[PDB]
């Protein structure tokens, strides 16, 4: 641990600074250090962890898609041979992306998930587990693609089961989980009907519970409901 000599509170402070500076690689490293102190994370701290890695992997995924598209174009008929460089560089980015996913999955397995007893924390971490297996699935092409997909599905399903038992239908973690699991169904599992059903049922059950909410909670929940609607519009 490069961060082993730094105070937990200092790591969290610096993660917040890194976020303000849009230094997401630094933010992720600080948050990894904080997790490795061994104490459970607060809600705010869980958010910092998720924001940091979402931004790092998001950039990698975008780069990977650019390179994969160039590669695919190079393998079409009439395309002039340009040697191994496009494949090599796509592989480089892919390997870095896989590394980040493995790091996050590692933190969740050692030992965030096992120590998370409250619904809000356990669902949050299981959603992350699904998400990072989904990112691995996006780039998987070999013997293990099926197992990676199943790992994502299993994590999302456990999260769904807990969220349905323990959280109201407007809870933003529950909504965001459903949003992402729906995307998993559409983009990864080749199950667009399941994706659409999940998004619709989630949206409608949330709609029915909005009346229970404060203005601020209403804002939070409706934001994510709109994302569900946006996907439905894209898919139908």
């Amino acid at each position: 641990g490069a961060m082993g000599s730094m105070e937990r509170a200092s790591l969290i402070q610096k993660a917040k600074l890194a976020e303000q500076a849009e230094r997401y690689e630094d933010m992720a490293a600080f948050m990894k250090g904080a997790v490795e102190k061994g104490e459970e994370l607060s809600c705010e701290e869980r958010n910092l962890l998720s924001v940091a890695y979402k931004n790092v992997v998001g950039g990698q995924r975008a780069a990977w898609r650019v390179l994969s598209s160039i590669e695919q174009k190079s393998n079409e008929e009439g395309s002039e041979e340009k040697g191994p460089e496009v494949r090599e560089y796509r592989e480089k980015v892919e390997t870095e992306l896989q590394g980040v996913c493995d790091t996050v999955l590692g933190l969740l397995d050692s030992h965030l998930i096992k120590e998370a007893g409250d619904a809000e924390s356990r669902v949050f971490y299981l959603k992350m587990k699904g998400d990072y297996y989904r990112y691995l699935a996006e780039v998987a092409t070999g013997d293990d693609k099926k197992r990676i997909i199943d790992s994502a599905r299993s994590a999302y399903q456990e999260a769904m089961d807990i969220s349905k038992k323990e959280m109201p239908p407007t809870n933003p973690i529950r909504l965001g989980l459903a949003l992402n699991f729906s995307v998993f169904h559409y983009e990864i599992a080749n199950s667009p009907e399941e994706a659409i059903s999940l998004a619709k049922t989630t949206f409608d059950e949330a709609m029915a519970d909005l009346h229970t909410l404060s203005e601020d909670s209403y804002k939070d929940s409706t934001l994510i409901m709109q994302l569900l609607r946006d996907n439905l519009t894209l898919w139908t």
Partner: peptide, 5 residues
């Protein structure tokens, strides 16, 4: 890209 959070 469909939306995720």
């Amino acid at each position: 890209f469909p939306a995720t959070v």
